Subunit: 195 residues, 3 copies
């Protein structure tokens, strides 16, 4: 499978998904994430289908490393190949947002990380960010571009985010541990599934 | 071939060279660069002969990655092996400059990046920088060391520099694409070539 | 062999050890380091036994790269596997310090770099730092955490530290050379050895 941007799958209004977080071949915890398809339909569907991992070239978040990590701020992942992609024949995802916007001020928010092409145009891919804290004077979450678009929230596993954040407390000369995504998937969306 | 620092080749007063810029196995554009041999004879000759790629251990810029890149500032390349070298049996190039100096204030200037040896002495190699913009308050080009010595200018392909610069617009968590040098070479210098 | 944290070996009050510093397959100099076992018994013993390299999984500093380096400040090494470890079946080393504390203000001090586990608890491993200068307004050694615990001093080879520091003088676009540890070992401790 691939999907078309012209004819988007529909995974539900609020798909829910999970991701194990792995460190040194051991699962340290599981994140459970509720998505807001009305924030950004194409970016939400790409996230959910990559979580399902059935799309083929197989495209999954499983095995992805957290490649940019910042104590008291965020973690970032999504290099599904090292590079990022999309379920839409790896087509860039346009910034076509839905009817609602979610502020980017709280701990455990999921967002998609923008990039700019050769013409200066904004696109999205599999690259995603999760916040480790709320905005406060002591961090730089208030500095994130509005284009760092919120598409979901963690509803289980904030304590796993805390473990990650503790382990990345900075010290000169200390390199961070390498976190990765383990098993991942979507929970059944019963409203979408019923017949 | 190798060359000798005591007996420098002469590629012309203003050799002209080209470099394709590659991203993801596709050529995104070509830079055409005019060099100022009177700025720095040995550093100019090393640049030009590496562009020709006929010197052997084969020493070419072809395939080199742009390893340090900074939005609104510069791109840097020259790791011809990952490390840098020279056509002079890989001897360091001394800071023996020519009769003229070129200011380092404009977009599309080519320069050689200095390094310091165990004794604190300055040398140059295949490592080179191209500016992505003019000096302005919003960038840090005015902070470059005088030792970041200008040896040339881009006379074709500034629009390729613009494409690069757009694609490296920073966003927290976004890793930059990897640019590299494709085919490269020197144009015939007709004054040097005529008989 | 492994060692036990409950039953620590004793390498002497002030074990002395050496490390060759290698750059490009050539030895550039040797560091000779005197340790203060009374600063931190378990962290000192781990350092000394890794220097001996007889402990097995073989655990040695020999071949380790200097992975974090900062001009006019410090160099850092200790990734004995790329990751760090300990001679105590790779158990974390607790912050159980000895009777004395050594200030962290001078050139050529050896220290152990802390890390934080998932619970926010501090531990140490094979990761170690050597200072390249004294504290001064122009550097950031005064910013080091008190947890960057001094366990020794260089008593021979400060001139080797100078060579390293010169070669890492920063220039935009210049990547640093890669330094590593060559042969290493402990000198006989005659008070411990006599019978
Ligand atoms: Cl579950
Ligand atoms: Cl620190
Ligand atoms: Cl051409
Ligand atoms: Cl941002
Ligand atoms: Cl010796
Ligand atoms: Cl500089």
């Amino acid at each position: 499978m691939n999907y078309s941007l012209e004819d988007l799958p529909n995974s539900g209004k609020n798909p829910r998904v999970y991701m194990d977080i792995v460190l040194n071949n051991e699962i340290i915890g599981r994140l459970q994430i509720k998505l807001f398809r009305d924030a950004f339909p194409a970016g939400v569907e790409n996230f959910v289908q990559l979580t399902n991992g059935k799309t083929y070239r197989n495209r999954t978040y499983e095995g992805c490393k957290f490649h940019n990590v910042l104590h008291n701020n965020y973690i970032v992942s999504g290099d599904i190949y090292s590079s990022a992609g999309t379920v839409y024949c790896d087509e860039p995802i346009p910034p076509v947002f839905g009817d609602y916007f979610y502020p980017h001020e709280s701990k455990g928010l999921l967002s998609l990380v923008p990039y700019t092409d050769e013409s200066g145009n904004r696109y999205y891919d599999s690259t995603f960010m999760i916040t480790l804290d709320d905005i406060r004077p002591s961090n730089v979450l208030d500095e994130l571009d509005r284009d760092q678009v919120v598409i979901g929230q963690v509803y289980g596993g904030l304590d796993v985010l805390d473990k990650i954040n503790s382990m990345i407390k900075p010290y000169a000369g200390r390199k961070y541990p390498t976190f990765s995504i383990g098993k991942c998937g979507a929970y059944l969306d019963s409203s979408q599934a019923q017949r």
